[PDB]
Design a binder for this molecule. Structure first.
Ligand SMILES: CCCCC[C@H](O)/C=C/[C@H]1[C@H](O)CC(=O)[C@@H]1C/C=C/CCCC(=O)O
Length: 1152
């Protein structure tokens, strides 16, 4: 496990101490505090000492070219007799080999420790972020959604890992440049400055690119976040989007977000491609200008000078034109993270109640609670009652102390428990979610479980109450998680219970069972302040408080094959472009090798010669080799991005069109998060990291092949050692790779519980903060953070274990080239050896990176496969057929079912059979029956959500013989759950612009909603809150009624919806629906039978068969009818009223 100096608690507490200290100094000054200053003051002392590695390592990198000059010098002055020289030359090859091993170790030590340093910063920052989140002020939480905080950990803090890697090169790079300039000066004189002048033009330009890249990346994130939030509501709402046929509107909305987003990605990618192209060509330019100026100044090319100089510039090429720019960009990216984090860190952060008045926000036109005056004492039940918005839940929040008085006073005695109306549940076992860290005891537990009506589900769960649960309770039903949430509070045996209408979360039988056995009986000794709409229970309450107008008013995977690679490339461009993509890659490297070979050839030719070389020839071909290198290096870089970004564009469009036409069965099988991960996570890789990692891999891979090719071209005998040395690499790689994918698997699975704990906590915050549970919930995060730290730690160490041994076989290659040249020295010339050795030394950093990036590519291809499979989903029958209805159709509104059979899957059971019925024009019909009898399947048949067997007719057209959008648009659905989609009210009422603004207000008047919209500052064009949060559920259902009122249609289907409205407004829309749709034929699924008893017929489903379909009075006068038995099951008063109503209405409807 992770040792104490890396453990979450210790490591986050340290930086927090410096943050609090910096706040105090800023407050003593005038200035705003700086989180960057706190980080430096925390970590500088341990980070600076790592600079010793870079100091010694870079000193070695400048010495190693000087040794190489003395080895090459043996071939220039060669004499086969003079053994004393031969022994000395063997001495330098030993020193050069020692340099190579020392340099390899120092490089691995430095890069190891800076990567630990970055890990610690991340771990400390996550601890700070989570510690803040518990304490956020209840009003200041309203301006930052849970997903925005979770994005801090997911995206923003993961930058700090990268920041620490390159910072030392901000000084070591420039200093090395100065030293390298001084070294070159002794070797090639003033011509040194020509190469440095290029270098000091590159430095600003590459730094500006890094700044401008960061700005584009920041401006892109807004579109990506908007696309993901929109795509989340598409995937979550997909049945409603289908039934309204609104697919065209979300296609347009996602299309244009993606079209904006992809344009910034392209530009961004070209910038980043230009940066990495610069690193490729930089030395080739620097060397070109240096030796071009050198020969115009009258100097002559000699092998020793060239390859020493080439090797020195190679040092500068890493530090100044790769590592220094990488620092600037990653520091730039750091500050955007620090800025967003700082803004979060600076966010705001017996019972008696008398004169109590309070504001949730002083900008409110009134206090949000006012003048409350009541008290309650042990043994009493207080019921809190009143309309919507009367402040009932605010009263509980006041007694809980989350809402302090602006006037009046509150006091409480004994232990407090609070139960929120929305259920909350976390991971662990469901019993653990009930115990909440208390000790288990059967004797209290069984009493709690039976009083909470919860026993049956804890038996039927697949491992009972020891079933493991998801971090937000997604593994439980609403009624289960509600009772689990209540059972937790009831287990606490508290003295004051604050109950925010948990009874509203469950069915009426369960509600009274909870009220009787728990609230009345088990809690009998205790103060209960129960908010509930269960006003029918009030006879049992000891006292009753009625609120109105805000005041008191009354009192009483794993592996991927070649097929995925071919598809990924070919999806982006025609194969002709891909062949050209390969060719420019080869040509880039060939020109790159040939430029260095040309210097070697020129050095050899100068050695053969008074007479002198024709500079127009040698300097001419030199200039063409360089220019071709530059041109292909640029084009190669850009074209990789063009193809791979175009591939992501094509695969997104194909995937999105598939998900739109995919049948609902696809979403019944795959949970929402698993689909959305393709769009957010997998396409995120394809847009960003994957194209860069391909270019990074391809560019290094070709250079490794270039080094080995150069060596075998000069010293063919190397092919003999290279066979064993190759075999060793294959065995080593084979052995590593399997453990490599084990730790990448382990790393992934250990990361996700961290983010899932933050989101779990943020939803539950009114619970965990109530029971004083902040300390325990910190240690839970520290545990998950610590377990992830092990897998990350193992990933780091295993990566270095591998890389160290790859550098051992690289060092054997260098040793073979260095001594092999001295053994074979009769046969090969100084410029050949200088070429071969110079190339061999470059291998040391390069080869281990090439082989590790290979695994990165392989690992990310799993994302590519996971999206390609979604391009191949089965499709619904098309939107419009070759046959199409006449525009007058439908016109009567006949529907017929004839021998209809339905199942949700072809291998699934039938859930409607032989269903055969007529629905006449302007007739009114209700659907009734048992739970699971098939009621929901009747909608699914008629909308063809799954294709029925048999015949369905609408106005004598078979619904199978017309397009889905012909059918779906000519019907109107009022769904049970409302949805308001993000956007304006105008879009939510009309996404296609076919109703006039006059008509839209006429609709908004007829639903009696206009005034509350005119109170909004932008009126109909105002942006609604996410999910409609600025409206209650009943208010949102008014907007669904408005859509149906606007869309003129003959046939209306009502999905049991109005019973979810508040009773004083359920009755209102029930009245409106009778008024407005008098001209329609009407279908209505309903539980609250009193809402349909008037209808001309009712349909009763027993189980998959339509057993009754008749006039409701004619049903009820059959006392043996299922419909009678159902109303008889409601209760005597209900059955009397219903039967009386049926008799009266049936008589009246027989009079005409
Ligand atoms: C972030 C760099 C992206 C581009 C890299 C480029 O394609 C290759 C650079 C090679 C170069 O040829 C020699 C060398 O040492 C580089 C690899 C080092 C990268 C830093 C992390 C090293 C380590 O962790 O061991």
């Amino acid at each position: 496990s992770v040792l104490p100096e890396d453990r979450s608690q210790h490591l986050g507490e340290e930086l927090q101490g410096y943050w609090d200290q910096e706040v105090l100094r800023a407050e003593k000054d005038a200035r705003e505090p700086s989180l960057t200053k706190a980080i430096i003051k925390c970590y500088w002392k341990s980070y600076v000492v790592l600079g010793i590695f870079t100091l010694i390592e870079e000193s070695t990198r400048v010495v190693q070219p000087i040794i190489l000059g003395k080895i090459i010098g043996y071939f220039e002055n060669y004499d086969p007799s003079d053994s004393a020289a031969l022994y000395e030359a063997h001495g330098y090859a030993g020193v050069l080999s020692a340099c190579t091993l020392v340099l390899a170790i120092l490089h691995h030590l430095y890069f190891y420790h800076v990567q630990c340093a970055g890990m610690r910063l991340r771990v400390a920052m996550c601890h700070m972020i989570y510690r803040k989140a518990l304490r956020l002020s209840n009003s200041a939480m309203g301006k930052t959604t849970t997903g925005q905080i979770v994005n801090l950990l997911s995206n923003d803090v993961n930058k700090f890992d990268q920041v620490t890697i390159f910072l030392h090169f901000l000084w070591a790079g420039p200093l090395q440049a100065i030293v390298v300039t001084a070294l070159l000066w002794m070797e090639i004189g003033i011509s040194c400055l020509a190469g440095m002048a290029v270098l000091i033009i590159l430095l600003p330009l590459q730094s500006c690119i890094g700044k401008l890249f960061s700005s584009l990346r920041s401006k892109t994130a807004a579109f990506t976040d908007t696309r993901i939030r929109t795509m989340n509501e598409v995937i979550t709402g997909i049945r409603i989007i289908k039934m309204y046929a609104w697919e065209k509107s979300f296609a347009d909305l996602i299309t244009n977000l993606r079209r904006k987003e992809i344009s910034k990605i392209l530009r961004s990618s070209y910038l980043r491609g230009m940066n990495l192209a610069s690193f490729f060509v930089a030395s080739k330019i620097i060397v070109f200008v240096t030796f071009t100026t050198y020969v115009f100044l009258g100097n002559v090319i000699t092998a020793s000078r060239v390859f020493v100089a080439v090797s020195l510039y190679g040092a500068v090429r890493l530090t100044v034109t790769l590592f220094f720019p990488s620092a600037v960009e990653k520091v730039s990216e750091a500050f955007v993270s620090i800025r967003r984090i700082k803004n979060f860190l600076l966010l705001d952060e017996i019972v008696n109640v008398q004169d109590f008045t309070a504001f949730w926000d002083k900008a409110s036109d009134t206090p949000t609670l006012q003048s409350l005056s009541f008290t309650v004492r042990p043994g009493e039940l207080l019921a809190v009652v009143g309309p919507v918005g009367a402040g009932k839940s605010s009263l509980l929040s006041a007694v809980l102390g989350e809402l302090p008085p602006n006037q009046g006073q509150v006091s409480v005695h004994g232990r407090i428990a609070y139960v929120s109306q929305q259920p909350w549940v976390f991971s662990g076992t469901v019993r653990s979610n009930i115990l909440f860290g208390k000790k288990y005891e059967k004797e209290r537990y069984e009493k709690v479980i039976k009083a909470c009506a919860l026993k049956k589900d804890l038996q039927l769960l697949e491992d009972g109450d020891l079933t493991m649960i998801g971090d937000r309770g997604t593994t439980l039903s609403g009624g289960q998680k509600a009772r689990v949430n209540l059972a937790r509070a009831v287990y606490q045996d508290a003295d004051i219970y604050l109950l925010d209408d948990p009874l509203s979360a469950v069915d009426a039988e369960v509600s009274r069972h909870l009220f009787e056995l728990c609230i009345c009986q088990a809690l009998h000794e205790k103060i209960r302040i129960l908010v509930t709409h269960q006003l029918q229970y009030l006879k049992a309450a000891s006292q009753i408080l009625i609120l109105k107008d805000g005041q008191m008013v009354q009192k009483g995977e794993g592996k991927v094959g070649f097929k995925a690679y071919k598809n990924y490339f070919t999806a982006g461009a025609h194969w002709f472009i891909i062949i050209f993509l390969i060719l420019v890659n080869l040509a880039a490297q060939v020109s790159y090798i040939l430029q260095d070979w040309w210097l070697s050839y020129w050095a050899n030719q100068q050695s053969a010669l008074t007479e002198k070389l024709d500079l127009n020839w040698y300097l001419g071909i030199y200039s063409g080799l360089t220019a071709s290198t530059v041109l292909f290096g640029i084009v190669r870089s850009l074209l990789v991005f063009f193809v791979l970004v175009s591939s992501s564009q094509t695969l997104h469009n194909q995937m999105f069109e598939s998900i739109l036409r995919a049948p609902v069965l696809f979403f019944d099988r795959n949970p929402i998060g698993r689909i959305l991960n393709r769009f957010s996570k997998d396409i995120g890789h394809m847009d960003d990291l994957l194209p860069l990692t391909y270019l990074d891999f391809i560019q290094t891979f070709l250079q490794v092949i270039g080094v080995v090719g150069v060596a075998v071209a000069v010293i063919p005998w190397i092919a003999i050692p290279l066979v064993p040395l190759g075999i060793v690499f294959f065995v080593l790689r084979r052995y590593f790779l399997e453990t490599s994918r084990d730790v990448k698997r382990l790393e992934s699975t250990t990361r996700s519980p961290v983010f899932s704990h933050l989101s779990s906590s943020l939803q539950g915050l009114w619970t965990i903060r109530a029971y004083k549970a902040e300390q325990r919930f910190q240690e839970l995060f520290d545990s998950h953070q610590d377990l992830h730290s092990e897998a990350w730690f193992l990933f780091l160490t295993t990566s270095r274990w591998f890389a160290v041994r790859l550098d051992a076989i690289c060092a054997v290659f260098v040793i073979v080239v260095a001594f092999g040249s001295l053994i074979l020295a009769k046969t090969l010339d100084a410029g050949q050896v200088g070429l071969a050795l110079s190339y061999a030394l470059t291998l040391m950093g390069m080869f281990q990176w090439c082989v590790r990036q290979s695994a990165e590519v392989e690992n990310m291809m799993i994302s590519v496969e996971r999206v390609i499979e979604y391009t191949d989903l089965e499709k619904e029958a098309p939107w419009e057929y070759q046959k199409r209805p006449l525009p007058s159709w439908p016109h009567e509104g006949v529907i017929i079912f004839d021998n209809v059979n339905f199942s949700y899957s072809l291998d699934g059971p039938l859930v409607l059979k032989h269903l055969t019925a007529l629905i006449k024009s302007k007739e009114k019909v209700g659907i009734v029956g048992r739970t699971g009898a098939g009621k929901s399947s009747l909608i699914a048949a008629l909308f063809r959500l799954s294709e029925p067997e048999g015949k369905i007719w609408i106005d004598k057209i078979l619904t199978t013989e017309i397009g889905l959008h012909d059918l779906r648009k000519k019907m109107s659905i009022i769904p049970q759950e409302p949805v308001l989609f993000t956007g304006t009210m105008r879009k939510n009422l009309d996404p296609f612009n076919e109703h006039s603004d006059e008509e839209l207000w006429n609709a908004l008047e007829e639903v009696q909603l206009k005034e509350a919209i005119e109170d909004l500052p932008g009126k109909m064009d105002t942006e609604l809150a996410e999910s409609g949060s600025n409206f209650s559920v009943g208010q949102r259902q008014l907007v669904c009624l408005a859509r149906a009122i606007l869309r003129k249609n003959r046939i209306l289907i009502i999905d049991e919806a109005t019973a979810n409205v508040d009773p004083r407004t359920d009755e209102l829309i029930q009245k409106k629906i009778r008024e407005k749709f008098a001209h329609c034929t009407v279908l209505t699924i309903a539980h609250r039978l009193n809402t349909i008893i008037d209808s001309d017929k009712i349909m009763v489903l027993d189980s998959g068969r339509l057993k009754e379909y008749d006039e409701p009075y004619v049903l009820l006068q059959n006392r043996d009818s299922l419909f009678y038995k159902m109303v008889q099951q409601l209760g005597k008063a209900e059955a009397a009223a219903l039967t009386e109503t049926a008799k009266q209405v049936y008589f009246k409807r027989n009079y005409p």
